[PDB]
Amino acid sequence: NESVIESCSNAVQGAANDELKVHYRANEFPDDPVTHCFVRCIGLELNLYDDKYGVDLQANWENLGNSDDADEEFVAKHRACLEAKNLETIEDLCERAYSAFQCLREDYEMYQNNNELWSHP
Ligand SMILES: [N+]
Ligand SMILES: [N+]
Ligand SMILES: [N+]
Ligand SMILES: [N+]
Ligand SMILES: [N+]
Ligand SMILES: [N+]
Ligand SMILES: [N+]
Ligand SMILES: [N+]
Numbered sequence: 453n454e455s456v457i458e459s460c461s462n463a464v465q466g467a468a469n470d471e472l473k474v475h476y477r478a479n480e481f482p483d484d485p486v487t488h489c490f491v492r493c494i495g496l497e498l499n500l501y502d503d504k505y506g507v508d509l510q511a512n513w514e515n516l517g518n519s520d521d522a523d524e525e526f527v528a529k530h531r532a533c534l535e536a537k538n539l540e541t542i543e544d545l546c547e548r549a550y551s552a553f554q555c556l557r558e559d560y561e562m563y564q565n566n567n568e569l570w571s572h573p
Pocket of ligand 8: 568
């Protein structure tokens with residue numbers, strides 16, 4: 453939502469940038485250090501993500517336009533994707549969050565073009 457985008461742009465060094473914020477409002481998140489931290493911030497603020505517990509797959513399922521329990525294959529597929537990214541070995545917390553969310557890119561893009569289950573318990 454608008455509020456979280458604005459607050460995260462202030463919380464993250466470099467993120468209060470006109471050009472970057474045009475991307476963010478368009479659900480476009482480039483692979484750069486500022487955006488890494490921005491994506492982490494949004495994930496934390498919306499409780500979609502946690503540095504320790506990773507991606508809340510149920511919260512993300514709900515953020516993809518659903519109100520029910522996540523499909524089992526959605527949970528399985530993303531648990532496996534996230535495990536394959538060896539997130540615990542990524543020292544930079546922003547890079548870690550950005551890498552984690554790459555697993556859900558296809559889902560968010562499909563949802564956008566149409567309009568707890570922590571991965572690391
Ligand atoms: N900022
Ligand atoms: N700022
Ligand atoms: N962040
Ligand atoms: N959550
Ligand atoms: N399911
Ligand atoms: N991981
Ligand atoms: N999806
Ligand atoms: N939660």
